[model samples]
Target: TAPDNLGYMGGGIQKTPQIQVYSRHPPENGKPNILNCYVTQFHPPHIEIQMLKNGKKIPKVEMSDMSFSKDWSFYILAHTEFTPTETDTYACRVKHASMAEPKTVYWDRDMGPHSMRYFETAVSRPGLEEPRYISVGYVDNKEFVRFDSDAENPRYEPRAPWMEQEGPEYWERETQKAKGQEQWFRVSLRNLLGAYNQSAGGSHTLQQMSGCDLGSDWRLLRGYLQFAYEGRDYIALNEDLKTWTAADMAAQITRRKWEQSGAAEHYKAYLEGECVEWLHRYLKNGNATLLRTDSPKAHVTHHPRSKGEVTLRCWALGFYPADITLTWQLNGEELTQDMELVETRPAGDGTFQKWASVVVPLGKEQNYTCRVYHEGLPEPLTLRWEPA
Candidate 1:
């Protein structure tokens, strides 16, 4: 799917590898530090991953199982366990087809700008000893504006170039001044939606109108308008805006006119012409970074299903690019029936996970294998489950 849209220059459909460092648990009590090096979502499938300690390559590093995206993209991982007494730098070197050279991600005690760092400040009134949370901001987190509840006119941080350079007071003043433009955009969108609905013989109250609803729910109004890039579907809004779906928009469109009368088409064009361009510009400018990939980790387990049956499960975790296939085999032949595979879901840290399971007769000491096929692997990764 991403490849189909590659012709668009500066589009956000290219494959880029992202390396993440994860620990199984917190480092404490002389417990060996277990770190997972996840190298995710590079194109061409064939990639190399290596572990480095203190700038030197670590010997005998083993990569974990590889997983794929629904569109046949690839991600894989490797890990190392060590006991640390002092500061050390550990890095994962990834070589992929998408890059001219290998890319390395480092993990260090003093790594700067590694992740989002949020800070909240509380302000106290003259008579009240307890301070209430007034402001919250993050370092280098430019996409979201800061919230200052205490100020009469709250303002986002990172003042514009032409704004006053005085202290917080001046910054807030300048931000409030800019709010006029923001409110104007909101009103314009609301009016556009209202006009469209009226043309279609439908009417919506201000509360029911998506554009007029100015709460957090309406923040992603852009996503309701869908568009295609190079014949493939693409949403020109922030990924974080998942509150609504294309179907939801379709329902609203169908209320006024028949679906065949190009109601959806006209509405999409209206949004694309009026709202989506600016929204896309904001997103493209704010998130102009390469895509990162994650590798999957596999595990096998078994349990009794009934008096005469046993259930075996194969779990793949922390993988990216969603195109992986998992199959179950009895002895050497593939089993078509009595197998269930769940859809791949996000692991909540920029990767995905899935599960496949099968049931077999109890007391059959036959060899059962779970084979995983992915673009990232030279061979299908097969794990065996023997009857206990």
Candidate 2:
């Protein structure tokens, strides 16, 4: 988790040897940003810094066995030419003395502190009793902006256009290709997902055409729409057995606009059905993939809103037409009536995903486990969280 409070010790989990850089000046200030890179707990103790202009690495300073400030954590101070011409990426790699593998952290993406603004103040002593702790506060000033760097700096640049495939020129070409009479949607989807298909050794590519390109294009629609876009209602079927739909056709137009504007992938995930599994993979892998049918893995996300209640979001992947049962057991006892389960949604790829929420009050004498059992699986998958 990113630190909620800055400039003061805020209790959050930060893995040892993490690197963070910050810039105090705002982007609008037109000044070069200052980066303060922190290397927490340099075990085995080595830190290497390199500068990149466009994508090419430029060597800077290399040092190790350095003394750590505050808690014996090693750190390096570096500055760059504040050429706001375009965004640049920088990184620092740390190798510990005790470990064989050197963990690497990047300044562009891993640094999260730069985007938050902090405020500090001292409060008067309470009349009833002396104040035990002074008051301090920090708030994320970026309302319309999203932070995506290695540190909490106000000047951390927004993610690049190509980084998110957000450019008008890119979308204009895709729009024209998708609007064509033959294999338009197929061409459009290919462009939207990029060359992943090419890497996957598939040739569903489309060019100018006239008659129904059934297998080439319509089949492509299944992946794009994730089985959500199906039937004559979604796309019109022509005499040649060709298919097209207003929703299918219209989605292309929207995608073109989105591609040009450089929207985040989070928005795309939201639009394509937020399967609970997608969120899990995103959190785990830093990117999301369609859940498989054979794996039948389970994932749970918990949010403790108040002392009395905590909400749990559950997901399972790769199971077929099997009955899925979710049971909540408190300290091993089955919970009845206090739980609410939602219907599972088809993952556009035949495999199903579902979510259920239960409000477990605080002061309960039990730990809760959400167990899922499907056909053919030898054992049930379970998730547990304790509310003390």
Candidate 3:
């Protein structure tokens, strides 16, 4: 066989296999918006193309192979489309039939000053420390999706089947709906507490709120019912329910009272049982109101031995100067200049910041109050705590 690398024919050599190579989409164009790659070679050979993302093969198009002309080395074609909102890395590998492994080149636009070249991953810790990762906290086993609480922060409006942000109509409609739902709630409550044990046979009767019934299961059930019905127009308990009503037991009750009655003692027992059933129903409709706000009370840390020694500290925040005032009150009564005050510059949010502290030698002799007045809210905010 004639050696192909010999300098000339007279020198007893043939021309080296002319395998000049070129690329349709060069490797320098890092993360091109679109890429159509083709290899042009000078030798008769087979070529293969491989594509990768983040250094991993996409697996969809594992490998594409093609044949080349006798005069050309080999040829292969590949295409890729990239429009990364953030950053992405893509690479291409070329192989010939004789080659054991393909030769690969990567492109990363965000890696360097040169936008059209491969660069290593950028290292940045914007928040001073590497962010901590959280394990799966909430996930619906059947749905196979992360729970809303586990989703990214500042999430979009919630869209859950059970979640509902009550509107004006919701409360009114619930009231009418509750009129019907309350009946069911009462029955369910009786079933849960087994209140029927007193009546007919098993634990069927209830007792006075403060008498022997002080801490009985029936008393607790009565309190729960009060909590459910307060500030509502539908449900009402007996006026004399004391620990709950601060009054006397009623002679006759309305709205689902026991039919069988004998002595005053027996009537009270029947009221207890009826109250339990009514309360359980009140809780079932999920008709309670919720109060929420981002701005909450500030916690102060410090100890004052005596009345005049009590000290109050307020956290100041804002970027711009703001008119701030701190007032002292004793048992809700506004106190005059008996308290010392301090003020500070604006914080990051452009709001004025101020704080006040008072030293009372006899701690029990006086009640301290800290009132914060600012333009943030329509009404002044107050913080009250007892001294140690």
Candidate 4:
């Protein structure tokens, strides 16, 4: 066994991380650009990422706020501004639970990052505007493959760059797969309506969300299959337990049928095994997108409260990616127990904004600083209220 120490810990749905070392724009020698080391899609959220230049840790590196994926896994980005030249080398190092050794991704001179969901929906009665049955696959939050029942002889169609390049052989297989699921949905919709003792029903809908999340460590990290009917929950499968929990009495009937028919075994095997193979293949085929940044404008305002107290508010306006640290600091140390930060929110435009506020004495405002950490800044911004 060689004394394993790689955080495998019996493997209860763990994901290693994926890293992308890229410049914000096309790299050109001597032009200032952002060097981003984005580490993402890892579970358990215990990992490390460090940006490097010439085999050493780079200075002024700022890390984005840790964010989560749809599956409760984690993702983060660390970046700094640098000018590319002929002599410097750049890279990012990652250590996670899925790997025996740490992995380092060097900045590609010409390339960028990789960034999932699987769901199928069917309506017993088709509306005039939308299709009756539809299924979609996403990679990096962009539609990569899709199937719509309305299309003539519908099948899974490639939507992205690499997916579009796939040949007919691939499409044929995927189309067949989707067709099988579509038929299943149609038949199930009928069967369920009968179970409910209904006739040619109203807008009864069926939705199934079955997805396997593949981690950067080359393993399937999360799997689930959920069914919702008429905009409400119907049933769900727990891949690890290999069991189904029905939402109601009618759903329990379907659950018993599926469990007894060994459907859970089949789908669990597929999601944890073959589906991961497919996901890794698609990620290898093509990647995600280039990120853009917007600068944040800092605003500091003081509101006088009752009893001679004041609230100092720091605003970070018009930023992209929305991972920012707004701190109320006194003498270079962050003020903790008295500070309150609002959630980052949309800025009405294409950007995002956030604010953090703290309570201070009215005349002592000059001793406080509002520090902003964001990928858009080369150095952290420090703000103080200037008495006009």
Candidate whose lDDT is highest? 4
Please provide, for model 3 over 1-388, each residue's C-alpha lDDT reduced to its tens digit, 9 standing for 90 to 100.
0000101001000111222112222134444444333444512223456677778875644222322222212344455554443455667766654445666766433210000000001111233222111111101100110111123551122122222443455344433432332233333323322321222121111111111121223243221111111111122234443222212123122122322222233434544553344323322222231111123233343445553564555433331224556676777887667666543322222233345665544444346556766545457776656446
TM-score of each: 0.34, 0.24, 0.21, 0.52
CA deviation > 4 Å runs, candidate 2:
1-295, 362-366, 386-388
Candidate 2, 1-388: lDDT as tens digits: 1111101100111224555543323232345554334454443223455544454554443232223222323344444434333456554454544345765555553111111111111111224221111111111111111221112431212221222323455334423322231122333333423422232232221111111111311121111111111111222212222222233554445434444554324323322333222222222332122112243567666666676776765556556543577777777788676777754433333455555667766544246777888753678877865334
C-alpha-based local distance difference test score of model 2: 0.36
lDDT of 3: 0.33
lDDT string for model 4 (1-388, tens) is 0000011001003667877676665589999887877776675455788888999988788875434444444567788888999989999999886798999899877431222566566766633333277776766444577788878888777766677667788888777777667666766777766777665635456666666665557566677677766545677777573887777888877777676677777667766665666767777676443235777888898788887888888988878766788888887887656898765654334466677888888888988999999978888999988777
Q: Give the TM-score of candidate 1.
A: 0.34
Superposed Cα deviation of residue 342, candidate 4 (Å): 8.9
* Local distance difference test values of all predictions, in order: 0.47, 0.36, 0.33, 0.69
- Candidate 1, residue 149: CA error in Å? 12
Give the CA lDDT, 0 to 100, for residue 86 in model 3: 45
In order of listing, the candidates' clash counts read 14, 28, 35, 0
Deviation in Å, model 2, residue 362 alpha carbon: 4.4
Pairs that collide in candidate 4 are: none
Using lDDT as the measure, name the better of candidate 2 and candidate 4: 4
RMSD of 2: 25.0
